[PDB]
């Protein structure tokens, strides 16, 4: 299991709302194309953040993760998630949620 | 029939979105308590504005109507609607929508 | 794999020597009693620290790990290792080596 921490950013980049959800270490929830048609972790995470942060649009936001440099990188692909977890050594995945 | 015009207000009180819906001249849509349990026009209007203006909360907004003076009066009662229509002579009811 | 960082402490608790070794995520290196006769991780770690820190005795030292409070707890049992790793979220296990 891996708890993912999300940080909501308003206009002054100030923490509006905080919420976390339990995630599986598994690559993807489903295997069939009826349930995985390419993505998996990204589409899963972006789903929870939507229901968790109703303050903004359901799918009208980008999640930005810090890199080795610290800069924000708006991720939106499973390939980018596998990389983002490579940074964190612990079982906590922090990310910066922003509404488009 | 009576078309109700709503004006969405952001932070700078600037018209974000515009949308209208056809309303009935009738007092209330239903008569039974299963369908009218006190309110009628207010609850009906506030319902449409929610589905029409998804940009904000479903029921986390107040509709303000101009008076004889011009000032905004956040209405939220059927008794206030019957009065608001008394101002307009035409078949067009304008109101200022604001998200709480 | 899990890199274990060790910190050598002299008389003034000052970092004398620094050295790291690659460890396996596995419970124990061997299964037979000829190779595991109770311990496993502790006996393995304490073995490397000895060859790595020849400055002191081969088996005349105690390794102290920080707890939730931060205090040092001289560990010397496999049961204590499994717990020590539970603190660190990353893949880096830090410990304070002291010669008896």
Swiss-Prot record, chains A, B, C:
Ubiquitination by UBE2D2 and UBE2D3 increases its ability to bind polyubiquitin chains by destabilizing the UBA dimer interface. Deubiquitination by USP15 releases target vesicles for fast transport into the cell periphery. There is a cross-link at residue 89 (Glycyl lysine isopeptide (Lys-Gly) (interchain with G-Cter in ubiquitin)). Changing residue 69 to A: No effect on interaction with PRKCI. Disulfide bonds: none annotated. Ubiquitously expressed. Residues 1-48 are annotated as: Interaction with LCK. It comes from the Eukaryota. Residues 1-100 form the PB1 domain. The UBA domain binds specifically 'Lys-63'-linked polyubiquitin chains of polyubiquitinated substrates. Mediates the interaction with TRIM55. Both the UBA and PB1 domains are necessary and sufficient for the localization into the ubiquitin-containing inclusion bodies. The PB1 domain mediates homooligomerization and interactions with FHOD3, MAP2K5, NBR1, PRKCI, PRKCZ and WDR81. Both the PB1 and UBA domains are necessary and sufficient for the localization into the ubiquitin-containing inclusion bodies. It is linked to Paget disease of bone 3: A disorder of bone remodeling characterized by increased bone turnover affecting one or more sites throughout the skeleton, primarily the axial skeleton. Osteoclastic overactivity followed by compensatory osteoblastic activity leads to a structurally disorganized mosaic of bone (woven bone), which is mechanically weaker, larger, less compact, more vascular, and more susceptible to fracture than normal adult lamellar bone. Induction: By proteasomal inhibitor PSI and prostaglandin J2 (PGJ2) (at protein level). By phorbol 12-myristate 13-acetate (PMA). Expression is directly activated by NFE2L2/NRF2; creating a positive feedback loop. It comes from Homo sapiens (Human). Residues 48-78 are annotated as: Interaction with PAWR. Changing residue 65 to A: No effect on interaction with PRKCZ. Homooligomer or heterooligomer; may form homotypic arrays. Dimerization interferes with ubiquitin binding. Component of a ternary complex with PAWR and PRKCZ. Forms a complex with JUB/Ajuba, PRKCZ and TRAF6. Identified in a complex with TRAF6 and CYLD. Identified in a heterotrimeric complex with ubiquitin and ZFAND5, where ZFAND5 and SQSTM1 both interact with the same ubiquitin molecule. It is found in: Cytoplasmic vesicle, Autophagosome; Preautophagosomal structure; Cytoplasm, Cytosol; Nucleus, PML body. Residues 41-100 are annotated as: Interaction with PRKCZ and dimerization. Molecular adapter required for selective macroautophagy (aggrephagy) by acting as a bridge between polyubiquitinated proteins and autophagosomes. Promotes the recruitment of ubiquitinated cargo proteins to autophagosomes via multiple domains that bridge proteins and organelles in different steps. SQSTM1 first mediates the assembly and removal of ubiquitinated proteins by undergoing liquid-liquid phase separation upon binding to ubiquitinated proteins via its UBA domain, leading to the formation of insoluble cytoplasmic inclusions, known as p62 bodies. Changing residue 71 to A: No effect on interactions with PRKCZ and PRKCI. This is Sequestosome-1. Changing residue 67 to A: No effect on interactions with PRKCZ, PRKCI and NBR1. Loss of localization in cytoplasmic inclusion bodies. Loss of dimerization. The modification Phosphoserine is found at residue 22.
């Amino acid at each position: 299991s891996l708890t993912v921490k999300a940080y909501l950013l308003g206009k002054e980049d100030a923490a509006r709302e905080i919420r976390r959800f339990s995630f599986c270490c598994s690559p993807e929830p489903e295997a069939e194309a009826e349930a995985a048609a390419g993505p998996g972790p990204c589409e899963r995470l972006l789903s929870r953040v939507a229901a968790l942060f109703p303050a903004l649009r359901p799918g009208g936001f980008q999640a930005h993760y810090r890199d080795e440099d610290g800069d924000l990188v708006a991720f939106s692909s499973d390939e980018e998630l596998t990389m983002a977890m490579s940074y964190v050594k612990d079982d906590i995945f922090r990310i910066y949620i922003k509404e488009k």
